[model samples]
Target chain A: SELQYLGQIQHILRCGVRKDDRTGTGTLSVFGMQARYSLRDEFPLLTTKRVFWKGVLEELLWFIKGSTNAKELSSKGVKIWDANGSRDFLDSLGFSTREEGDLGPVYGFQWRHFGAEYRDMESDYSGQGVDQLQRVIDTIKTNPDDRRIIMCAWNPRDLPLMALPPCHALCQFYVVNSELSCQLYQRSGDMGLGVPFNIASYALLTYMIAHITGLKPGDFIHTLGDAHIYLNHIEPLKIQLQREPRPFPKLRILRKVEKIDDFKAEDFQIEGYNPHPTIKMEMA
Target chain B: SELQYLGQIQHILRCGVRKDDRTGTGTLSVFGMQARYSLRDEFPLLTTKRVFWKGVLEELLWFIKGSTNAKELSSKGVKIWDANGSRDFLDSLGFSTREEGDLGPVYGFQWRHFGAEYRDMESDYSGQGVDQLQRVIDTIKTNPDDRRIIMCAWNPRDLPLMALPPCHALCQFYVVNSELSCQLYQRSGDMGLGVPFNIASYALLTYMIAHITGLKPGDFIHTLGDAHIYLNHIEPLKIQLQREPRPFPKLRILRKVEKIDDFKAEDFQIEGYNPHPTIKMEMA
Candidate 1:
């Protein structure tokens, strides 16, 4: 799988290099894709850099809860939030920086309170963390027409409070002919390094959502706003691209919990991911 | 030429859809190109489509002045303006929408602006208008290091005001040991219908800019972002892809222009643009 992706990246970047702006000086070509899985399969990314398992599990929970705080990140030992001490872009814009307020509510605040005041909150939603992903899946299986089936992590209000805004900003669940589908809207993406992670993560998310929702996963859609390649990640991408991709592995989520939030890191296991030696690349 | 473009619109709409989009709902594919010409060999498109030869002429003028009001567009009968009576996105974004601005105050407003505050009006840029295009050509002919010249129109802040924001936004000027090169960056594109026009328009623009920038045109680069094919525009694209591409017609900008803003309708002319008859298609 890794090698397959690496080759595709090489071709894309080789032919297309943005040569005008601040980020145009890089040689790595980053690309984004969408794939789906069935919950009966294995968890995502068994051979890709240890899977960032803890980070992935915890972030999923945090996303469903709509909380963008580093507290959750720290608890999971995923230091991805370390640089965003207390200041995020949104805070700086609204005079709500750390100097003035707390580290900020981030995506969580905005997901729950997307401006214009909250008119209603489903009592069934609170505390049902992972189940939220499940519920979205079930909704796709059952009442697919409900527009309320949208989930978002982008809170422009708290953008300044964090070091960077969420890349996969919003997602929506859809149902077509009994098949569950998900469309993710990413605001900013490092096409070379991060987009692969995004593809796997969201694809996993969609499958998980479909599972609890009692629908079959169909397609995963990823919409990116500002997709780009980081200059530093080019070599590793080239090396990996030279290898051939292995068969896809199956993923398994351990939890059958009725409530979304009840699942923990222990509730997941990936069964069959096989690939060549992993390439070491610096992460931005 | 109008008939050629009309056929192009039909071709793209029939096919040429964007291959990727998370939604599976498919996006439109739009492509744009920029080519340069030696004034002695070609004539720009003026015979095809009413093109309000004047509008094209005056719009070029408006861009140099960095003015976005309808005064210039209206005078030339170009309806490219937004529905309501307001300044174009460029002007609204603080490039000085009205004539209250002065000499040499154009696309450089953002690049030269000091933190969005101080406007640099010291150096006389009026000479840099159309003359800069020639200057680039001359530099390409003489020296090389002094050729990173670029022209940009996209202002991130101005997305909200315009009826339609600028798509083919930036053009670059490069000199490699006396060879002049141009690269065009387009933000959003409708490949099937709009791209042909973009290719023709910018190629013409490049010739004009190069003529005044003092550089001999060597190569044309076309770059695209968010290029898509509207679902409605699919069938037409297929038809276009089937037809043989005709020989690129010679484009000629008026040979007489001291200042970029001095370009008049009569200054432009297109020689041999014979192509197949036009085919009609919808915009949406």
Candidate 2:
């Protein structure tokens, strides 16, 4: 059972105060919370409600591939990014000539090449910015003890230019006794819809990185700045809390993926993932 | 008593595993931790051991000034940055012909102006990178509920070009019900020597920003990546921990300083602070 993950949402419900947010859906929110999961015990997929494991893996692979446009992802049958990449949203942010389904210089772009001069969604950004993902991988292999192995997606220069600011802004990796742990600092967490996806995605990222670097997966620590539940999500979440929890499932990487960039959606599989029927919710 | 802060260090001592660090001092470390203090209730100055209140203030003013050189701080009789700015350290980082006290685009430089190109720490950097402090201040006044009001000092492009990477990499400001809260994410913390200074400095920052932006001070949350204690300072910290904690102090801004850059060292005072004598510990 994913009690640790459930505990955070429960705590927010019991003590969270109402606050108005950018989305205008309004939220019962708390500030500054931490969630810890031991990947050694089980992969941190929630068993109380079914998580879209396919969507999570495809999105992560898109990020690792350093693609800003949703063309490749749409080809893979992922539509989670459709609204964010909509022309109306991009135009509101002052991107006039931007192509549809192209999110300009978002998380994926920043992870692989940070601080790169982002002209538009389609411009060639080759050999620009620092290759943070590659550098982090290299350091993990050569110098695992180094504390400076960090990857940041929040670029001040790109913040104004980005269609939507990075929710998971920065993350750092730590290694001890051949076990690798990761910490993610997210500025905002939409507890109902986005948080579940964010957690599974980053946890999988840790597993992929550890696999490539020859280290065992240790822990996934999620740190949130503004932890909130939308006004509408309270009802279904209340139902979710009443269900008796089930045992966590195991995540297996089916093949030997040598490079992070070479990961495919078919490369991942979840075993014994029986869970309660999905509870529907709306995104703010 | 600041039991929450003390509890973290104690938890580390009891259960933290050994890990090698960049400083080569070795540490008993834990990853992904958070501490919360309500600034409205108490000014978070540690009471278990006396903190250098003057050094804390002057060093903060040094960062707000956007001056990369430590000469101005040394002029104010603060030698904290001397070791970090020494000729030996600068030469080791491939800085030749650099001024003696120039700390090439470090914390203050990144705080006020982030992502600026560095030539030799003395060139004119006017209108180069984004001015995060100014922008954040502007956002607080215009739109207090904005979630994107973040100031990041961890520029991936500038990490290798600097003498030292920023430990306190990024911070976000949240406003609700006319009260402002701040969250700081620090990558590495030297608990014995640097952590006390770090907490006090950032709390003061939250107070100053609240004062200038016409909002009441709220909570100041400290999030750490690698929370560790050096082997050499364990004995001193243990001795310091034996003493009982005293009452927390209140910080007062003596004048209505309109501009953040206009405040001097004498414009601040701490009322009713008494604590145990200082514990001398070496910085690695």
Candidate 3:
């Protein structure tokens, strides 16, 4: 139920300690939190507030494609990258040479191809870096019992070159009784603004990978290093929390997409997503 | 209190999903669990059963020395390397050329010098890989407010070259209000034999780092991916569980040690460690 998901927000609000964060915004934060979502029961899209499923899907598809630039995601009508790619932000960090909308060596770059010598954000990285996504798929098919099927997006060498280092740093996939489960380790989480997307994105990823690997979707376990809500987001989150949760929507792939990269955004649909209005907050 | 630590094993016993594991021993396992220990209150050495404090200290020191060879740990009477370093095991794994006790680019190698191009277990890795531990210390000393002070032991490129991949894969350190806290993400946990040592090892690490950085010791959050107890050890564990948990021991560093590498085994002493009899179990 969405109650478990909502309960995390409530728990953080009630018990989190005050801390200063990388983003200038102060936060009510807690260290080390774990949440579990079962994809078999229902899709974990929040019913308390509207979750942008399109943005979640498009961003994931972009990561699967291993594209670092925001241009691809921007073309897909996802505005999530706009803030991260703005020249003002980039220049503030003294990354003057980087072009606007270039989010160098982020999630996709590490997912599909990792540890490849990273040039600028726009350089061609074909046949470069380790193909972890493909290797995971192969391992799921061949050695599903192996516990080493991990997809890590944290590259210490390339952290300085990126607009932002990965928050969801590492992920590991597990298979038991012909079901695929994934766990993500996010070093820092923006509980109000970013966490919902993080949850749905990885959940969708688990579903996509499970589909491609010909296994049943199991669980999406989200682990947080520093789980926090910005002070500005507290009121809206509480308002949203007051609203009782409804049934979660169901996700269906409209087409038979075999490869992870082959699936287009149009191929997926969310049904029965009746929810409360979206509560927008400052990203900070 | 050790009650919080003992409670994890109890919860696992009550509710754990049985699964086959890499070691060929079946496990009653659970995914995504977290336990918190306040180092200021007491050292989180297990009180339900006796834990090997010396082995924990020696192993961590070995890791800090960046010595991949178990020769040092072996000489220190730490037989933990005996199984992983046996000639027959290395020969079976097609690492016949590697010297005995040479665990390739494992925890110590990755911790001290990560991303070093691991040619072989015996090859020289001088001036190679990222010194994450050093970096962590430097960051703690200089930029204590930084949230990205993480120590990662999971290297995707070097997985195949290792004798055994790291179980306690990655850890992130956080400084808040002049206190240092650590969160460890262990991919696998053998509840009976390995977990107690894992807890003490990282707790000691947090203490050592906090000591060097001139910060008070904070919480040590232990998060596990697959927390399991082997089938054979269930009886012993249950018997151990029947005993009441004793008061946690306090770790005292006798003298001031300036650097992480300068601390000797004799420098650490545990006070008030009265526990139940040791429960022996076979490692898979």
Candidate 4:
């Protein structure tokens, strides 16, 4: 099933492939994926490639909390933002070399203080992002439309402002008529290395969000913008593609974490994910 | 004065243009304009470009009424949907084609579809293209900040099926500091030919919507998807670019009509719209 998602990513890759100096382009390239599974079914996983569990979970929570510093992340062994702190490509973009504390807030800030913008799904229940989510839940409960209803987080403005933005910028929800169907639109992405993680992340997000909201995760549809495979990431991506995708593993978010920020690394576990090899990718 | 709107279109022609020959792609562009007068600003258009008051009013009503055959429009001298029933693009895409009807209902069909998917902003809102003018008014009065507070007749799925789908798919409702502002996003355009009319039409829509909603009209940000000048129209466009633009024209929409669908061409009138020569561009 996970491999099926990779296939969807590959399909989008076939459409918008562009070559980056970092990685030569391939026929397949895309930014993200949306995988919907049933809360009643198995969990999502890090099967194809090993993801730093502490890294992904903490980052998601951190985003929900809208934290800006890197100390918490670095303590967890995830260095996604290490590049930003050191001013990788952004050094030329007017980012004055700043310590972790000097960097700006990314998703969290927008989600919270773009001041009272979102209509909380659980609350007033008539707003856009949240309202749609609620209506979807009701549909699943009473009128079950064989589709997934997901919301996105990728705000284009984040590109210039983030200390380091997540590779996967948006998310979606799916409802299963027979199986889950999800649609996600990503603004910017590196097709090769980023897409894999993107698939896993949203598949994870969809599984979790759907589970909580009440729906079965089914299929993931990935839509992209400027999807590119960096020159350096090609070999690694090829290796990933060559290997057979095993059955998706079971994911368990240990506690009944309510808000997005409540989950901790210890709060989760992955069961199946067995893959062949580790292919290397150049750091973007 | 209405001819002056033609001049502005010509000016934009000298600028950037979009070309995709791979699919034999081209368009016979039409300018759709709208403006809101405050019963407040005295009148909508201020006499800079000829507003073709009669044509504009008739076209808006035509769209609302869902008359794709064009005999009615031809009789009325309204040429917007004139080219090969450009108005029926969605019908060609299987909207009515699938329905086994006269293909009379497309945008209108979506808007009026009672059980239509509500939240799929891109795909949902259809049904004989609901009297959107009324909806806009109601939303402006009720929930203004709801970014999803949108008026859309553009259904991406239906685009490929349409003999002539809408280019300026949907117009957004914006309430800035409580002042109603409208921004329209058009996927493609023949700037030299369509822009002037397009601007006025939406501006008119904004004003009318604002009026019904009881809000004041602000700015009309016409965001373009692929704003371009046609190759054939380039020379004429250049000539018009040389002409100086005069004061803007004032537009007037007949007041007595409360129900959006009850409008007639005679309900509108434009004054001013003074400018220069016309440019010729071949239909794609």
C-alpha lDDT of candidate 3 relative to the true structure: 0.86
Chain B TM-score for the candidates in order = 0.62, 0.96, 0.96, 0.71
Report lDDT (Cα) of residue A283, candidate 4: 63
- Top TM-score prediction, candidate number: 2
**Residue by residue across A168-238, what tens digits does model 4's lDDT show?**
43333333333344444444455555555655565665565555554556655554433555556556665
Error of 3 at B60 (Å): 0.7
Tens digits of lDDT, candidate 1, B1-284: 23444444554455534444333345543332122333234433423332333444555555555454454456667654432234443354454543322322233332222113223333333322233344444544454433134343433232233334455555555543334555555555565556555655665666666666565555555454345666655666566545664544565665756555566567666556665555555553
> Per-residue CA lDDT of candidate 2, range B214-274, in tens?
8999998999999998899889988977889998999999999899999898999899899
Query: Which residues of candidate 2, in runs, are more than 4 Å off?
Result: none
lDDT by residue for model 4 (B225-276), tens = 3345555666666565555556555666657566566666666666655644
DockQ of each: 0.03, 0.83, 0.61, 0.03
Model 4 in CAPRI terms: which quality?
incorrect
* Best model per DockQ: 2
**Model 4 misplacement above 4 A:** A1-284, B1-18, B22-53, B86-106, B111-133
The TM-score that candidate 2 achieves is 0.97
Report the number of clashing residue pairs per model.
Answer: 93, 0, 0, 83
Quality of model 2 by C-alpha lDDT:
0.86
Per-residue alpha-carbon lDDT of candidate 2 for residues A4-108, written as tens digits (9 for 90 to 100)? 768988999999988888786888988899989888856888778888888899999888877888776877888888777788887877888888887878888
Stronger candidate by TM-score (2 vs 3): 2
TM-score of each: 0.49, 0.97, 0.96, 0.44
In what order do the candidates fall by TM-score, top score first? 2, 3, 1, 4
